[PDB]
Design an enzyme around this catalytic site. Structure first.
Site, PDB file in Angstrom:
ATOM      1  N   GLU A 101      59.065  23.548  25.582  1.00  0.00           N
ATOM      2  CA  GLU A 101      60.465  22.518  26.910  1.00  0.00           C
ATOM      3  C   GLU A 101      61.498  22.837  27.203  1.00  0.00           C
ATOM      4  OE1 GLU A 101      62.085  18.995  28.666  1.00  0.00           O
ATOM      5  OE2 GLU A 101      60.087  18.654  28.619  1.00  0.00           O
ATOM      6  N   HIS A 102      61.683  22.970  25.836  1.00  0.00           N
ATOM      7  CA  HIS A 102      63.655  23.659  25.642  1.00  0.00           C
ATOM      8  C   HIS A 102      64.182  24.997  26.011  1.00  0.00           C
ATOM      9  CE1 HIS A 102      66.004  19.546  24.152  1.00  0.00           C
ATOM     10  NE2 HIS A 102      65.028  19.455  24.257  1.00  0.00           N
ATOM     11  N   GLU A 117      69.036  14.714  20.253  1.00  0.00           N
ATOM     12  CA  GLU A 117      68.633  13.754  22.024  1.00  0.00           C
ATOM     13  C   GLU A 117      67.644  12.965  20.786  1.00  0.00           C
ATOM     14  OE1 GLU A 117      66.084  16.345  23.425  1.00  0.00           O
ATOM     15  OE2 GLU A 117      67.985  16.911  25.651  1.00  0.00           O
TER      16      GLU A 117
END
Ligand SMILES: CCCCCCCCO[C@@H]1O[C@H](CO)[C@@H](O)[C@H](O)[C@H]1O
Lengths: 443, 48
Positions: A59-60, A136
């Protein structure tokens, strides 16, 4: 123009399937703007001990460029047309979607396909994101609410796949290989397990066409077009207690196993949750709120906030509540909370469900407030129910619910069950499991 | 000297049976409730 009529006059959702197995659905309106995206049936649940957090790692990179167009190029092109590119990855579902002018629906579809099929996975970009993801994880570690829900899954589904967090382990993030991500993408981002959904002012036939053009790469064998059924995740009545009296407030989440998407009872559980509702110190309503629990919270200052939830999944789910409170009001809050849950199974009223049904209707209507949310409904519905479910159907189902039905369904999933408990922060006042377990009967 | 001799012993018989039964049932219940603590696990995860 009555509520009923407006529900019937809503444009239908069109679905068509390509030969590769991919499904294309869309609801048409008259908006110059639109949202289109691909909802994939993938997530942490599909990962395992070695590749946990790969779907997140992906997703990154899903936005750092493809083969046909490197980073800068990919970005500039999307930015320069005023389109928004977002996405997310959960435990059982992933999604990459774009917001833009219907006038570009086709260019977008090409962009999406390029993202899900030809991610560059730049060896250097990977090491760069490895450090970002690690930052994160430390940021999210201060999100008590999310730390609490992760723990709730960690114990409620301990030993199974749903026990893992979406972001993954520190070890995994530190050792995932370019090959692993690659493998992930290939193993999961596959036509039959995806859905091209779009909403706004778009031609279903024009959508499906651009779809045929870019979403191709058909499969040869049978193992490539079959959607793998996941192994069942065992629910466990238990508790995990993370104590830190240094934290200002305490978070608590209690839950019982839920049915799973396909079960009709979910309509009732949602009506049930509607009766208990939710609350937070900024609800003007105050001591007059309909939700009994909310009223008590206000009167006795039981918490900063509380919320109910019915988190569904393919074969299971989590039905419970979550509250935040000062170290000294945890016991009373838990008491009143479990009390309301007993009232549900035992003494729900017609008036109660009447209100809760209305509240629930406007809740479902509110989840279709914009192109993105409607597009999200479609992706999810086909992916979970294998078909779109109209507001008119929901309303049809919601209308059939009555007090008796609420009591029976709630009694079924709640009464005398062993719950899953997660408590974080200054939780010394929260009584033991046994005492909580007893709050599960009589009420 | 002890006219209640026989009845006393008939009671002793029941006392013994009921006792065996009851003691076992309560032993289980005590173990049942305490299982929560008996198998409980813990860890010390201090920061960074
Ligand atoms: C020791 C002499 C005992 C003579 C009585 C024989 C009966 C013993 O038996 C017991 O006797 C009690 C009182 O009589 C009753 O209340 C009991 O129910 C009976 O089981």
């Amino acid at each position: 123009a009555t509520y009923a009529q407006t529900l019937q006059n809503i444009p239908e959702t069109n679905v068509t399937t390509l030969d590769n197995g991919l499904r294309v659905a869309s609801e048409e309106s008259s908006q110059p703007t639109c949202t289109v995206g691909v909802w994939i049936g993938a997530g942490s649940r599909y990962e395992n001990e070695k590749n946990n957090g790969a779907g997140y790692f992906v997703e990154h990179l899903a936005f750092k460029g493809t083969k046909k167009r490197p980073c800068a190029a990919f970005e500039k092109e999307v930015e320069s047309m005023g389109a928004h590119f977002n996405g997310y990855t959960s435990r059982e579902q992933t999604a990459f979607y774009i917001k833009a002018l219907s006038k570009d629906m086709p260019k977008v579809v090409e962009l999406l396909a390029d993202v899900v099929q030809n991610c560059a996975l730049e060896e250097s970009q990977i090491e760069k994101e490895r450090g970002v993801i690690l930052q994160e994880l430390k940021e999210m570690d201060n999100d008590m609410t999310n730390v609490t829900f992760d723990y709730l899954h960690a114990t409620a589904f301990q030993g199974t796949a749903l026990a893992r967090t979406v972001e993954g382990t520190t070890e995994n993030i530190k050792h995932l290989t370019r090959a692993d991500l690659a493998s992930y993408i290939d193993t999961h981002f596959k036509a039959p397990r995806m859905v091209l959904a779009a909403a706004g002012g778009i031609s279903h036939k024009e959508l499906v066409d651009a779809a045929r053009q870019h979403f191709s790469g058909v499969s040869f064998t049978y193992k490539e077009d079959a959607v793998p059924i996941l192994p069942r995740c065992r629910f466990t009545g238990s508790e995990i207690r993370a104590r830190d009296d240094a934290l200002p407030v305490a978070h608590v989440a209690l839950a019982v196993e839920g049915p799973g998407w396909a079960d009709p009872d979910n309509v009732v559980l949602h009506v049930a949750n509607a009766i208990i509702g939710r609350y937070d110190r900024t609800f003007g309503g105050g001591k007059h709120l309909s939700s009994r629990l909310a009223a008590l919270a206000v009167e006795h200052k039981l918490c900063h906030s509380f919320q109910t939830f019915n988190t569904s999944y393919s074969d299971t789910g989590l039905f419970g509540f979550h509250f935040v409170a000062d170290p000294l009001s945890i016991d009373d809050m838990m008491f009143c909370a479990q009390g309301e849950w007993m009232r549900l199974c035992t003494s729900t009223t017609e008036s109660e469900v009447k209100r809760a049904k209305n509240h629930l209707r406007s809740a479902m209507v509110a989840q279709l407030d914009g192109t993105t949310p409607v597009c999200e409904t479609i992706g999810s519905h086909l992916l979970n129910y294998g078909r779109r479910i109209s507001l008119e159907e929901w309303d049809s189902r919601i209308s059939a619910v009555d007090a008796r039905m609420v009591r029976d369904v709630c009694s079924k999933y709640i009464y005398d069950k062993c719950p899953a408990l997660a408590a974080v922060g200054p939780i010394e006042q929260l009584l033991d499991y046994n005492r909580i377990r007893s709050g599960m009967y009589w009420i | 000297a002890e006219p209640e001799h026989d009845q006393r012993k008939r009671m002793g018989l029941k006392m013994l049976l009921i006792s065996a039964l009851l003691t076992s049932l309560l032993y289980y219940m005590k173990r049942h409730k305490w299982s929560v603590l008996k198998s409980r696990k813990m860890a010390y995860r201090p920061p960074k």
